[PDB]
Nucleic acid binder design. Structure first.
Lengths: 49, 107, 151, 89, 551
DNA sequence: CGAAGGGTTACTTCGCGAACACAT
DNA sequence: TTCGCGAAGTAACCCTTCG
């Protein structure tokens, strides 16, 4: 549904997830929090993670 | 519509949208000897009109987001000619399901 | 090794004699300290011919009784000459070392008498030395306290 | 704190010139908080100044004046000294 | 918790910190919430303006921008798309908000410019004309003269209209300088490629030689049109003198006063460069060429967005080409302007005392070298910065700061061993005033090393200048001190507002006649004492900020 | 027509994971 | 002491134009 045949792992998950703390628990928990505050992500919490 | 015969050059498509109402295509005589529509893995694709595009946005209460997206420089999208924001209806056929449908927005 | 063995007790004192002598070569002595008759349109479109130093000023400073044996102003003839360059001496072609800038700013202020005369004409110009005595008292929220902020 | 220094500040409004510029800054700041100066906001706004806003509000640029906006607030000095109606300010 | 030291906004913005403040100083928060907002993300239309400032709907963001439209503080771009409507896309104007900070000194030394003819009525009348001119953005002549109610005073005002128009202070405000200059070139460039779409074997030489140079010669003529274009003035039966057209607007022209301020800076330089008698005739021979051909201050009208391939040599060559022979009046001659009756000993003034400025260019810089009057204002600006910049860093960081900052300019990439042979510091005063200066720019070091991870210390860190950083950084620091001083003024006027509404409404002549009890009357001479000092610091700080933004 | 600038594809280096939980 | 793809980093080479 995203458009391309992509994966499930740590680069295949970041195609849709604007949720940061969901991405900051899957893998590379350090780099996903430093990158979100740099880009000023809003992160409206609605996911169950 | 332009049909290449061999490998393209980087300076051909340097100003493709330069005409404001029109454009050109980009093809290749190697990967055009068989069309992908008659292949058994590709189901029937058909483009909806602008009046039929706002009918599924009334039935499913959606907008110009939050739809399963299809992209440009896609072989179905290059065969059919989807410009931007055009809904294509897929009439895909699963085995134990029947003849259900799906809609894709073009980006 | 003519400058590494003198640290530092008379180098700043040696500046005063050579600066006073170049000021004597380029200007009158007593007529500079006051403004009475400012040096006659100064020197009447001054003195294309008059240079500063060639072959005599070194032996002049050597025989000026600087409480030293007459040894080693050997390479301090040009190094001290180019060493005084900031607001004091002049470079243009060769040996045209002139004084005119700081003979108004610090000569008529430090070694001079004070007066509250016609000084109500200085309008926002280049005044570094003037206006001492920073605050009396307490630096009321708009004084010199803020320059450390980078911005 | 931290004590750097600025060369210029002290002993400089005693002369008349800096005081003249300063008092004129006070006068400009006092006048500029009045908007249009009793003759204005009527002539040159249609003349090629934001046609999408000078066409949609052709009589509605007259909201800023000192003839009526300083006029309406000066009528109320007489309506209160003779009549009293209980309305919040 | 010790919030006195202005640590609350040290990483705030240097550019937002002044513009929004100057807009708030004359109208308030509802006008400061758009110029302070259009400076934070660029250009923006009206529909995408409402939902981000967090305020009222389109009925208020449109009204407060009209107050910025008749004050000339914003720039609009009337253009349409290929499928959309007609949009607005407002900008912000730099000089159109410098005018608010600048108006008081504008009128107060336009007085000294117009001092020449007479004494008494001219000062008050110019202080009534130009004060009302700058407080509006664009006014006419017939709308001003409907509130005079006289017959001879109206004649004097109508004379002073053309007396101010002949100087170069009142021009007809057109749209062609009320439009953004970064896109006015592109509008003169997209119809110019539309002018010649000829099917012909032309290479990329068409895009550099034909269209570019013809757009130059069609753009430099059209930017000089507001210099003098409203000149007919031949209405005979009304007045017996040159009368300004009533249905013609007028602005401040914004640029000749720039030139007068920078010429005042040049005379303030020349008071220290040459003697006391040479600078006077230098002033009387310099303060007459500002009204004919204005291009002295400006970073050029076209050089803002095409100096990217090779054109900078062409900009310097064209600048020094049109820089001469256009002000080409009498270079060293007599004039019936003013001779300053004094010893300005020389009791004879023709062709013998008026030749002392010929000995003003051969010494240290005034720079009118080659033949008679050629190149007087081109090779000063890279050193007029460098003369004032050293006198600030030396007066602030100490006399040994200019001794170190000027040595590295002579030989860039300098070591500490050979700067000890050039300077006279004892053992460690080379590096102590260096570390006291390294937190400021113009120290900027370059490293050599060819090691793995700094093994044997490799004799590294030889010092350069990079003087193009420190001038901009000094400009940022001075501009921040400007706006911080204005916020000190704003907090002062915000602290005691309960004693200001009565002290100016009905208390004019009786303020000393016991209308305030003697317990807080000293606050009225305290809110007027150091609020005078704020504007005095502002006056003496404009004379130092505006030297680091030359061409 | 020979030479210079812009730009596509191809060869080589790093880091992040490696399952749950009890007693040590 | 180990496989997986995705980031930079750097070179061989082809298209396009200049005088």
């Amino acid at each position: 549904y995203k458009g391309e045949v992509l994966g499930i792992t740590r680069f295949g998950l970041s195609k849709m997830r604007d949720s940061v703390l969901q991405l900051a628990s899957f893998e590379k928990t350090t780099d996903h929090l430093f990158d979100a505050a740099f880009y000023m992500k809003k992160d409206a919490v609605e996911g169950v993670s | 519509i332009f049909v290449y015969q061999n490998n393209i050059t980087p300076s051909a498509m340097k100003l493709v949208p330069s005409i404001p109402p029109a454009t050109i295509e980009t093809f290749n005589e190697a990967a055009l000897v068989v069309n992908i529509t008659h292949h058994e893995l590709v189901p029937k694709h058909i483009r909806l009109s602008s009046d039929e595009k706002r009918e599924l946005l009334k039935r499913y209460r959606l907008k110009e987001s939050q739809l399963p997206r299809i992209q440009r420089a896609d072989p179905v999208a290059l065969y059919l000619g989807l410009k931007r924001g055009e809904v294509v209806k897929i009439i895909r056929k699963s085995e134990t399901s029947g003849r259900y449908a799906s809609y894709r927005i073009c980006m | 090794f003519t400058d590494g063995e003198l640290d530092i007790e008379f180098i700043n004192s040696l500046l005063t004699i050579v600066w006073r002598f170049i000021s004597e070569n380029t200007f009158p002595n007593g007529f500079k300290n006051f403004e009475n008759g400012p040096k006659k349109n100064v020197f009447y479109a001054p003195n294309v011919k008059n240079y500063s130093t060639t072959q005599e000023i070194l032996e002049f400073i050597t025989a000026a009784q600087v409480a030293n044996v007459e040894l080693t102003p050997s390479n301090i003839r040009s190094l001290c000459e180019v060493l005084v360059y900031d607001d004091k001496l002049e470079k243009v072609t060769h040996d045209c070392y002139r004084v005119t800038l700081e003979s108004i700013l610090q000569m008529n202020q430090g070694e001079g008498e004070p007066e509250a005369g016609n000084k109500a004409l200085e309008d926002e110009e280049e005044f570094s030395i003037f206006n001492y005595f920073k605050m009396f008292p307490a630096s009321k929220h708009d004084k010199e306290v803020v320059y450390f902020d980078e911005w | 704190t931290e004590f750097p220094s600025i060369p210029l500040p002290i002993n400089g409004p005693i002369t008349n010139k800096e005081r003249s510029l300063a008092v004129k800054y006070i006068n400009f700041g006092k006048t500029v908080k009045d908007g249009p100066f009793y003759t204005g906001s009527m002539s040159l706004i249609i003349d090629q100044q934001e046609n999408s806003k000078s066409g949609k509000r052709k009589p509605n640029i007259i909201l800023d004046e000192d003839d009526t906006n300083d006029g309406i607030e000066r009528y109320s000095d007489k309506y209160l000294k003779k009549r009293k109606i209980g309305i919040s300010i | 918790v010790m919030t006195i030291s202005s640590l609350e906004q040290r990483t705030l913005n240097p550019d937002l910190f002044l513009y929004k403040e100057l807009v708030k100083a004359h109208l308030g928060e509802r006008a400061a919430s758009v110029i302070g907002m259009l400076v934070a993300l660029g250009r923006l239309s009206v529909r995408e303006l409402v939902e981000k400032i967090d305020g009222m709907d389109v009925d208020s963001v449109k009204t407060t921008l009209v107050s910025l439209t008749q004050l000339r503080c914003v720039k609009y771009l009337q253009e349409t798309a290929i499928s959309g409507k007609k949009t607005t896309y407002y900008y912000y104007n730099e000089e159109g908000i410098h005018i608010l900070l600048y108006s008081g000194l504008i009128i107060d030394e336009i007085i000294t410019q117009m001092r020449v003819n007479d004494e008494e009525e001219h000062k008050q009348l110019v202080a009534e004309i130009v004060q009302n001119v700058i407080s509006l953005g664009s006014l006419t002549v017939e709308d001003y003269l409907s509130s005079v109610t006289s017959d001879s005073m109206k004649y004097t005002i109508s004379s002073l209209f053309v007396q101010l128009c002949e100087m170069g202070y009142l021009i007809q405000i057109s749209k062609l300088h009320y439009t953004p200059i970064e896109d006015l070139w592109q509008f003169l460039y997209e119809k110019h490629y539309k002018n010649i779409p000829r099917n012909s074997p032309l290479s990329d030489l068409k895009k550099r030689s034909q269209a570019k140079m013809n757009a130059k010669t069609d753009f430099a003529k059209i930017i000089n049109k507001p210099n003098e274009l409203s000149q007919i003035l031949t209405v005979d039966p009304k007045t017996s003198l040159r009368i300004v057209k009533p249905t013609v607007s007028l602005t401040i022209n914004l640029d000749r006063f720039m030139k007068g301020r920078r010429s005042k800076q040049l005379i303030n330089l020349a008071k220290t460069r040459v003697g006391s008698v040479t600078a006077q005739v230098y002033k009387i021979a310099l303060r007459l060429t500002e009204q004919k051909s204005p291009k002295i201050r400006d970073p050029l009208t076209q050089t803002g967005l095409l100096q990217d391939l090779e054109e900078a040599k062409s900009f310097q060559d064209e600048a020094e080409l049109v820089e001469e022979k256009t002000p080409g009046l009498t270079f060293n001659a007599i004039d019936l302007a003013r001779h300053l009756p004094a010893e300005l000993h020389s009791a004879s003034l023709i062709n013998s005392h008026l030749k002392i400025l010929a000995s003003s260019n051969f010494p240290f810089l005034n720079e009118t070298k080659p033949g008679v009057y050629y190149v007087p204002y081109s090779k000063l600006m890279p050193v007029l910065k460098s003369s004032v910049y050293e006198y600030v860093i030396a007066s602030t960081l100490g006399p040994s700061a200019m001794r170190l900052s000027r040595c590295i300019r002579d030989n860039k990439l300098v070591s500490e061993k050979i700067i000890n042979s050039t300077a006279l510091m004892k053992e460690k005063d080379i590096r102590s005033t260096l570390a006291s200066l390294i937190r400021y720019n113009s120290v900027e070091i370059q490293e050599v090393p060819r090691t793995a991870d700094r093994s044997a210390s490799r004799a590294v860190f030889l010092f350069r200048c990079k003087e193009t950083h420190s001038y901009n950084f000094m400009r940022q620091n001075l501009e921040w001190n400007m706006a911080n001083l204005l916020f000190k003024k704003e907090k002062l006027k915000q602290e005691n507002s309960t004693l200001l509404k009565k002290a100016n409404r009905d208390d004019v002549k009786g303020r000393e006649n016991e209308l305030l009890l003697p317990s807080e009357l000293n606050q009225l001479k305290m809110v007027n004492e150091r609020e005078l000092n704020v504007f005095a610091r502002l006056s003496r700080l404009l004379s130092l900020w505006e030297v680091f933004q030359m061409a």
